Amino acid sequence: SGFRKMAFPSGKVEGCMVQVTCGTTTLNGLWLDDTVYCPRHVICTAEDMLNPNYEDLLIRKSNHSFLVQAGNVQLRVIGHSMQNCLLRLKVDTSNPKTPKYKFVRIQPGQTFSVLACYNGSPSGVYQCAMRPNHTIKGSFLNGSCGSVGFNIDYDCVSFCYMHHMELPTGVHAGTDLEGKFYGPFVDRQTAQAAGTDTTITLNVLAWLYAAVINGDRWFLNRFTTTLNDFNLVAMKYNYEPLTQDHVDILGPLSAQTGIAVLDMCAALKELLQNGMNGRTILGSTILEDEFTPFDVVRQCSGVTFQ
Amino acid sequence: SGFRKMAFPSGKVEGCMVQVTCGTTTLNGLWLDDTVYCPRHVICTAEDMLNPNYEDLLIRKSNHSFLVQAGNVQLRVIGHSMQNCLLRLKVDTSNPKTPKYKFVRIQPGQTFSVLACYNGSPSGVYQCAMRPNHTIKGSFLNGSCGSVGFNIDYDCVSFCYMHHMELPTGVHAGTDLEGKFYGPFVDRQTAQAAGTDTTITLNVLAWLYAAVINGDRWFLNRFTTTLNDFNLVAMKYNYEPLTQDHVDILGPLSAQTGIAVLDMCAALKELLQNGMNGRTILGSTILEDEFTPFDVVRQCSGVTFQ
Numbered sequence: 039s040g041f042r043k044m045a046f047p048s049g050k051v052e053g054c055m056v057q058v059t060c061g062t063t064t065l066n067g068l069w070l071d072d073t074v075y076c077p078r079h080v081i082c083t084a085e086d087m088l089n090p091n092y093e094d095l096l097i098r099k100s101n102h103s104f105l106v107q108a109g110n111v112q113l114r115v116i117g118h119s120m121q122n123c124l125l126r127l128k129v130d131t132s133n134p135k136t137p138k139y140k141f142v143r144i145q146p147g148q149t150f151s152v153l154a155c156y157n158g159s160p161s162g163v164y165q166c167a168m169r170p171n172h173t174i175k176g177s178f179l180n181g182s183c184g185s186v187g188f189n190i191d192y193d194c195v196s197f198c199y200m201h202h203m204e205l206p207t208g209v210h211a212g213t214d215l216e217g218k219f220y221g222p223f224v225d226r227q228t229a230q231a232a233g234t235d236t237t238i239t240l241n242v243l244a245w246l247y248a249a250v251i252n253g254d255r256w257f258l259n260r261f262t263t264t265l266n267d268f269n270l271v272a273m274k275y276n277y278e279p280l281t282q283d284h285v286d287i288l289g290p291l292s293a294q295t296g297i298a299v300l301d302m303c304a305a306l307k308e309l310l311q312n313g314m315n316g317r318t319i320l321g322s323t324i325l326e327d328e329f330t331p332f333d334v335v336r337q338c339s340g341v342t343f344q
Numbered sequence: 345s346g347f348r349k350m351a352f353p354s355g356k357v358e359g360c361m362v363q364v365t366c367g368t369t370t371l372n373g374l375w376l377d378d379t380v381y382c383p384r385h386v387i388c389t390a391e392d393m394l395n396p397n398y399e400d401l402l403i404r405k406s407n408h409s410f411l412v413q414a415g416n417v418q419l420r421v422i423g424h425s426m427q428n429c430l431l432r433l434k435v436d437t438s439n440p441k442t443p444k445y446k447f448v449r450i451q452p453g454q455t456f457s458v459l460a461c462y463n464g465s466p467s468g469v470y471q472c473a474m475r476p477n478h479t480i481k482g483s484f485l486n487g488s489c490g491s492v493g494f495n496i497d498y499d500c501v502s503f504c505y506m507h508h509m510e511l512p513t514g515v516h517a518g519t520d521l522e523g524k525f526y527g528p529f530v531d532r533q534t535a536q537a538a539g540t541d542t543t544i545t546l547n548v549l550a551w552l553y554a555a556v557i558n559g560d561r562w563f564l565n566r567f568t569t570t571l572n573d574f575n576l577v578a579m580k581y582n583y584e585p586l587t588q589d590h591v592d593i594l595g596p597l598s599a600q601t602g603i604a605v606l607d608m609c610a611a612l613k614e615l616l617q618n619g620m621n622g623r624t625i626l627g628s629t630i631l632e633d634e635f636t637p638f639d640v641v642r643q644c645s646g647v648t649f650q
């Protein structure tokens with residue numbers, strides 16, 4: 039029993055973290071096989087960030103403009119290319135600790151583990167959701183650029199995020215491992231701001247299922263709703279509209295608890311309208327939206343506490 | 345910026361997890377040098393748990409009564425002893441991935457990372473506090489016994505918890521790595537229940553400091569309090585009494601924010617009495633008590649956002 043924000047074990051990723059230096063700028067990089075990935079802004083000074091031309095900045099560098107350090111060992115750079123907002127540095131050595139891996143672009147609402155790193159040294163690990171507005175509510179200080187986000191399935195690491203910047207509201211933005219930003223953000227100094235965010239309806243519903251599987255039914259009611267009537271309420275409280283696809287995704291959790299999705303929606307509609315009347319759900323006084331249906335199935339018992 | 349429940353990177357611990365089988369019972373064990381640690385209840389059947397005599401159960405076993413599997417490799421047991429509520433199994437091979445390590449008994453209020461494991465295979469990682477009542481609010485299913493809790497300082501792993509059981513309220517109990525239980529619990533089937541718990545005052549105060557360092561001052565006030573007057577309020581709301589030692593511990597956070605401890609206490613007293621008036625602190629609508637002053641210094645900037 040219990041329910042916690044749980045990250046994937048971080049060891050396969052720790053063995054891939056290195057330090058990348060260009061001039062006086064140091065950040066983190068990711069070393070797989072004979073390649074090191076890092077944010078391209080490693081080539082900028084502070085004044086560069088105000089109007090950088092990356093093609094122009096990069097052509098001015100040689101292979102030996104870059105130092106890469108893995109633990110106490112210097113790797114020698116033998117090639118370099120830009121790919122969108124990342125650099126791909128080729129090095130003299132293949133990483134002996136390279137795990138089976140893939141590069142994946144995750145979708146808003148999905149979750150992943152972040153390994154916070156400084157000077158190529160991992161310091162901590164926590165679970166984040168990709169928000170509808172394409173930011174994450176992370177925890178990052180100076181030196182954290184190039185920290186990665188990932189999921190693990192079987193023994194394969196699916197890398198999905200590399201960290202690049204902080205926005206004025208204190209939330210975080212970055213790219214996938216092809217160097218393409220999540221959201222409309224750019225790696226240069228502008229007046230960019232996070233767009234208005236929304237609550238992830240599917241996840242809140244998944245988490246209510248988790249609460250039932252764990253033994254709590256206090257918030258259920260005798261009612262049902264149509265998809266359309268639910269959404270009118272959803273719009274008023276700044277929740278994402280629920281779709282038939284979201285309804286089908288919740289199929290297995292529905293089957294395990296014997297609670298129809300539209301009946302769970304009626305329960306959520308009542309919580310939105312009346313509040314929680316001083317009560318908690320899985321330890322929480324608010325409606326949680328950072329666990330997916332996959333996260334709930336991974337963590338909860340396959341047997342409901344009836 | 346940001347503030348998250350952050351666990352230590354788990355890799356050094358993943359390389360120490362093995363599977364231990366006795367008869368039809370399988371659980372996790374911890375392999376350091378040439379020794380494997382695991383809960384002694386691995387030697388019981390279900391009916392045994394109702395009245396087990398462990399000395400009597402153990403003398404009936406040989407070295408080869410135990411199988412230990414590390415990945416795909418069988419380790420051969422060449423000796424065994426009981427130590428309080430753990431078994432210490434000696435094996436044919438020293439763990440090549442043994443990190444620098446210590447065994448430490450943590451104190452109530454302190455935090456650690458848990459690596460949830462099943463069949464010797466790590467599945468997830470999250471941060472817990474040792475509660476005043478000597479339980480943790482973990483997340484554990486069948487097969488999780490022998491999962492460990494730990495902290496990391498520099499490159500040394502300080503092991504502090506091994507998991508043994510779940511209590512009727514759904515919280516968790518276990519031992520240090522000498523096999524001594526945290527709390528008055530025993531590894532046999534009784535009517536044992538978690539004692540009444542208390543909120544960890546020092547941690548709530550640390551977390552308010554974290555909120556100031558991160559840039560928020562909304563909950564401060566013009567008042568001060570004496571230690572004794574604070575505690576009268578503390579008792580009414582089921583918070584631990586604050587001591588001069590707790591006041592001295594908060595010295596560095598106080599210095600970094602320019603907020604005297606007793607002034608922060610007056611702020612907390614007002615929050616207890618008036619609630620939060622619909623507002624949040626570091627994203628939270630309630631007062632959080634699972635971050636220590638050490639946790640705040642580790643995660644937050646050393647420079648206050650004034």
Ligand SMILES: *[C@@H](CC(=O)OCC)[C@H](C[C@@H]1CCNC1=O)NC(=O)[C@H](Cc1ccccc1)NC(=O)OC(C)(C)C
Binds near residue numbers: 079179182205206228
């Ligand atoms: C990674 C690199 C770094 O630390 O540079 C300092 C010498 C930075 C990580 C940031 C820092 C605090 N949290 C966090 O997530 N990223 C940055 O500093 C970016 C660089 C950048 C500037 C302009 C456009 C894109 C990227 N800057 C940044 O995040 O701005 C602040 C912190 C001022 C809001």
Ligand SMILES: *[C@@H](CC(=O)OCC)[C@H](C[C@@H]1CCNC1=O)NC(=O)[C@H](Cc1ccccc1)NC(=O)OC(C)(C)C
Binds near residue numbers: 508510512533
């Ligand atoms: C580890 C061993 C196990 O899974 O045995 C099942 C064949 C168990 C971990 C528990 C299970 C659910 N969550 C969790 O933390 N521990 C136990 O099953 C203990 C064994 C025990 C019994 C009596 C006294 C001490 C230890 N039993 C247990 O936790 O009881 C329940 C789950 C019924 C409350």
